[model samples]
Target: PVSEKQLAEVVANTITPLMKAQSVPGMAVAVIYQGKPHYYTFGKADIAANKPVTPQTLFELGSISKTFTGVLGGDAIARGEISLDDAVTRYWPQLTGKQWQGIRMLDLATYTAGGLPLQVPDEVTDNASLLRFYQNWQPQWKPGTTRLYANASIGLFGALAVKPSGMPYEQAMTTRVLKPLKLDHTWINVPKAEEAHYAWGYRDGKAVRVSPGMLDAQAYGVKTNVQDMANWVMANMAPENVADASLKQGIALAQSRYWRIGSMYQGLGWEMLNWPVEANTVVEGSDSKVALAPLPVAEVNPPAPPVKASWVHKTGSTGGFGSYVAFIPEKQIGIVMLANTSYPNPARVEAAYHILEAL
Candidate 1:
C-alpha cells in the first residue's frame, strides 16, 4: 500500500520544485491506489486573488476532451447505434459522394482517417458547413494508410456518435457519459453554477482563455476539477465498480485499443503507450514523426485488444493549460495532473511515473 506521508513528501521534494521552475502558478493532482483515492494541490488558483488551489478547482482539459468524446462513442457503440466498421457516410449522407465513402467511423474515432489536418479549415463552422467542406476535401492518404493526429477526425466522430441519439453533442455527452459515471462537475462549457470554481488559465505570466474555434468544444472543451477527475479515473480503473452494466460496457469500450501506429495505440480518443513511462518516450511520441508526419500505410491496423498488464495514458494542452492522465489496469491505479499553463511539459508524466512506481 502507498503511504500518504511518503507520497506527500515526494510531492513536496519533487513536484514542488518542478512547478516552481516551470513557472506554474497552480497545479492539482489526483491518484487512485488500491481502490483508495488521494488528492494534492499546490500554489494559488490566481496569484492576484491569492486563492489557494484545491481539489475542486477547475481546469480546461483541451485535447483531453477527446477522451470524453471517446466515451460517448463507446456509449453509442454499446447501445448498438453504430459499429466501428460502418462507413462515415452512414451518419451524414451529405458525405456520401465524397472522400468519406471509404472512410470508416472507426477511422475518425481513432485518427486513422488518412491525413486529415489537425483542424478543419477556419471558415468551416456548424455541421452543414463542415459537411460542405468535406464534400470537396480528399484524404491526403487512403483511410487507414497513415496516422496523423487531427482534431477534425474525432470532432466529426463526436458529432456522428451522438447523431443516433437525436441529441446535440453536449446533451449526448451529459446523458451518456458524465451522468452515468457521476462526474457532476465536468462540462464542455463551464456552467454558471460552477463558474466560480473555474481557474483562470495562464501563459507566460499572463492570463489567457482558449478561443472557441470551429469544432473547439467537441475536440478541446472539457473543463473539470481534480475530484471529478478522480471519479473518472476511478471508473476507468475499475469498471466493475460501476453499477450499471451498460455504463460499464461503455467505459470498457472507451478504453479498448482500436488502432496502432508502431508502439503507440489509439483507444477511441485516448492515446495509449506502454509504461514505466519515460520523459524521452513521451517527448518522442509527440514529435513530428508521430504527430505531424505520415506514418507507413502497411503498418496501420487495429491494435491488439488492451490487456490488464500494461499502462495507458493521454496528454493535453491549450493556449493556457497543460494536463495529463494515465493508469495501469492490472495494478488498479491511476494519476491525473492539471496545471494552469499551456506548455506541454513532460515533467507531468515523469512525476506521475515515479508516483505510480512507488505504489
Candidate 2:
C-alpha cells in the first residue's frame, strides 16, 4: 500500500521536473486507488501574490468538458430521451433536406460526424448563422467513415440533444451531470462566491483564462478544481455507485466504443486503449495531428461492449490551461492533472502514466 508520504514523493519527483521544464505556474494531481484518494499540490495558483495551489482552486478543463457533454448525451439516450440512431435533423427541425440527412446523433457524439474542422470560423456566431453554417456545410468524409475531432460536431450535438429539456447546454449539463454526480466545484461559469478560488492561468508572463467562443462551453468550457475532477473520474470508473440509475447508464455508455481509429478505441468523448497502455500510445492518441487531421475509422459493428479492463482517458486544453484525466476501471485507479500553463500533451500523459504504473 502506498502511504500519503510515499504518494507525495512519487508525485513530486514525477511532476517537479516536468513543471520546471514546461514552466507551468502551478499544478494539482489527484490519484484514487481502490476508493482512497491522495492529492498532491505544487507551485502557485497565482504567481504575483504567490498563492498556493489548493483543493478549491478552479482551473479551466478545456475539451475535457466534452466528456460531460458525452455523459449528458449518453444519459439522454439511456433515459429514452433520445436514440443513438436519431438523425441530426430530428431535433433541429430547420436543418432538413438531403444534405442534412445522413448524420446521426451517434456520429456527432463520437466526433465521427464526417470531417468537421477543429474550430468553427469566428464569423459563425449565434443560432442564426450557426444553422446556416450547418445547412451549407459540406463534409469531407461520409458520416461515420472517419473521425475528425472537432468542437462543432459534438457542440451542436449537445445543443440539439438538450432541446427536449427546454434549457441551454450549460444549464442542462449542470442540472443533469454535475448535480447527479455530486461534482460541486465543476462549472462552465464559476459562481461568484467561488471566484476567490479560481486560478488564473499563466502563459509567458501574463495571466489568462479561456475566452468565450462559439461552441466552447459544450466543447471545452468546464472550470473545475482537482477534487471535483477526482470525483468525476471516480464516477467514471465506478458508475455502479452513482446514485441516479439513468446517470449510471450514461456513464457506462460514454466509455463504450463507437468506433476505432488505428489501435485506439473511441468512446463518446474519451479514448480507450488496451489495458497496460504505454505512454507512447497515450501521446500519439493526443497529438495535434489526431485532432486536426481526418483519420479513417472502422465502425464497431453492433458496438463493442465496454469492459473494466480497458484504459480510458482524455486530454484537454485552452490558451491558458492544460488538463488530463486517465483511469483504469478494473483497477479502480485514476489520476487527474491540471496545470495553469498549457504544456505539451505528452508531458501530462507520460507523468500520469508513470505515476499510475507506480501506484
Candidate 3:
C-alpha cells in the first residue's frame, strides 16, 4: 500500500504544478486506495475573493451527475419501480412524435437510441418544448444502430427517474444514496448557505470574472469536493454482488463497457479508453507502465499508440469550470479532478490521466 507521505508528496509535486500549468485558479482532487480516500487540494476554491481550495470546497460534477441518474434508475429497478425495457415514451407520454414514439428507455441509457441527436438545439427550450421538438425531429436511423453522445438525452433519463421515483432528482439522490453514504458535502445543486465555499469556474485559462451559471442540477448540474468524491469512489468500487455494498454492481453496470463504438468502448454514460502496450509486457512491472499507452475506447485506430486494454473516463465543462474523472477497475483505483477554469485548453482529460498514472 502507498503511504500518506508518498501520496502527499505526489500531489504537491505532480498535481499542483499541473493545475497551475493549465492556468486553473483552484482545483481539488481525491484518490481512493483500498476503499479509503486520501484528499488533496491546491489553489483557491473561490478565486474571485481568493479563497483557498480545501478538501471541502465543492466543484461541479457535470455529466458525472448522470452516474447519479444511473444509480437512481438502478435502485428503482431494484425496488421494482421501473423496468429497463420500459418504453421511454410511457413515462413522458407528452413527447410523442413519429421519431420518438417507439424508442425504449434502455436505448436511451445505453446510447443506442438511434436517430436522436445529442440535443434538440437552442431553438428548443425546456423539456416540454424539447419533447415536442423530439416528436417532430427527424430520427437519423432506427434505434439500436450506433452510439451517440447525448447529454440532453441522459438528462431526460433523470427526468424519467423523477417521474417514477416520486422524488425530485436532488431529493432522490440524497435520500437514496448521499445520506446513506454520509456525504453531506455532496449536492445536486449548490446550496446558498455553502455558496461561500463554492469554487468559481474558469474560462480561457483564467478565473471566470462573473457569475457562473447557477444550479445545473440536470444534464450537468451537481457540485462536490474531492473528499465526497472519495466516498463516492468507494461506494461505486464496493462489491455490488455482495449485499448492502452501496450498489456497486449497479454502478459497475452503469460504467462497464456495454458497447464498442468504432474503436472505443461505451458504457451507460462512460467513455472507455484502451491503453496499448507491448503484447508481452502485460506481466512486466516497470516496463509495463512505459510500454502501455492510454487511448479512448471510442477511437478504434487511436493514432499509433499500441493498444492494451480499456480504461473508462469522462470530462465535465461549463463556462467557468473544467473537470475530469478517470478510473480503471482492474487497477483498483480512481481519480477525481475539479478545476476552476472553464476556458482552458481541452487538456483536462490528458492531465487527469497523467496524474493518475503518477499516483
Candidate 4:
C-alpha cells in the first residue's frame, strides 16, 4: 500500500495550484486503484457559508449524463426493449418523413445522426416544442454520413429507450442503472434531502447550474458526489462486481467503441483514445470541431484491444460546473474531478493523467 503522506503530497502539488489559478471555490476528486477509492477535496461547496467540499458533495455532471444515457440504452437493448438499428420513427412516428426517414437508433446514440447541431435548438423550450422542432428540421447530411455532437440526438435517444419500458426516463434510468449499480446518491433531479450538499457552481463570479434549456434533463442532468462517481469508475473497472446480468451487458456495451477517426474513437458514450497521450494531442482532440466530423467506423482501423494500456475519458461543463472522468479498465484504476466553476481548464485532464501515471 502506498503511504498516505506520499499520495497527499502528490495530490496537493497537482491540484492546489490549478484550483488557485482558476479561482475555483470548491472541488473534489476521487482516484480508485485496485478497487480502493481515495478522495481529495479542496475549497468550499458554498463559499459564503464556508462549507467545505467533501466526498458527499454533489456536483453537476454536464455531458457526463450522456454516459448514463448510453448505459440505460444499452440495458434496454439487452432486455429486448430497443434495438440499435431501430429507426427514430419507430418511437415517435410523427418524425416520419423524408428528412427523418433513415436515421437509425445507433446514429443518435453515437451523435452520428446526420448534422444535428451541438445543442437543442433555441426555439425548443419543452418536450412538446422539441418534437415539433425535430419534425421541421432537415438533416444536413444523410444519417450516418456525418458526426455532430448534438444534445438533441442523445436526448431523443434517452426518451426512446424508456418508452418501451412504459415509464418516465428518470424512472427507467433509476430502475435500469442507478439501482442496479447501487448509485444511491446519483440523481437526475437531485432530491430535497441532498440539497444542502449540492454545490452551487460559478461562472463569471456568479452562482450557476446547468441552464434549464430544452432537453437539458436528458443531456446534462446528473448530479453526483465523488464517492458515487468513484463507485461508478470501480464498476467500469470490474464488471463482475455488478451482479445484474443485463446491467453488466449494458456497461460493456457502453464502454465499447462505436466509431473512430485518426486516434480518436467514440464509444457508446465515452470518448476514447490511445494513452501515453501527448498533452498537445489532447488539447487539439478536445476541440469540438475536430470531434464533430463524419469519420465512419468502418473506414477506420480497429482500435487495439483494451489492455489497460489506453485512456477512456469524457469532459463536461454546465453554466457553472466542470467535470472530467477517465479510467483504465485493464489496470482497474480511474480518476474523477469535479469543480464548482465552469472553467475549461485542460489542466484537469493533465493533472489526472499525470497522477495516474505516477501510480
Q: Which candidate is the best by lDDT?
A: 2
lDDT digits (tens) for residues 1-359 of candidate 2: 75778777888989989988998889988989879878888889998888999988899999899989889998898889898899888898898657667888998888777777778889987889887888888888777788888898888888888888788888889899998878888988888999989899977778988888888888998999998899899989998898899899999889888888887898888889888776787777677866567889888877787888888988899888999999999888899999999988877888888889885
| Residues forming the 10-long window of minimal summed lDDT in candidate 1 | 297-306
List clash counts for every candidate, in order. Answer: 0, 0, 21, 0
Q: Rank the candidates by lDDT, best first.
A: 2, 4, 1, 3
**Tens digits of lDDT, candidate 1, 209-274:** 787777787899899999988888888778788886667777778777665567676687767666
Error of 2 at 180 (Å): 1.7
lDDT of each residue in 25-102, candidate 3, tens digit only: 777888766666767778887655878989888787766776667766766666667766789878887775667766
Model 4 Cα lDDT, one tens digit per residue, 108-225: 8888787777887787787688777887787777776667787888888888878989998888888878887889999888889889989999888877777677667679989999
- The whole-model lDDT of each prediction reads 0.79, 0.86, 0.63, 0.81
- Report the backbone clash tally of model 2: 0
Candidate 1 overall lDDT versus native: 0.79
Give lDDT: candidate 3, residue 137: 64
Clashes of 3: 21
Give the per-residue Cα lDDT of candidate 4 at 324.
90
Q: Rank the candidates by TM-score, best first.
A: 2, 4, 1, 3
Which ranges in model 1 have alpha carbons more than 4 Å from their true place?
275-279, 287-289, 297-303
C-alpha-based local distance difference test score of model 3: 0.63
Identify the superior model by lDDT, candidate 1 or candidate 2.
Answer: 2
TM-scores of the candidates in the order shown: 0.94, 0.97, 0.80, 0.94
Q: Candidate 1 has which clashing residue pairs, if any?
A: none
| Whole-model lDDT, model 4 | 0.81
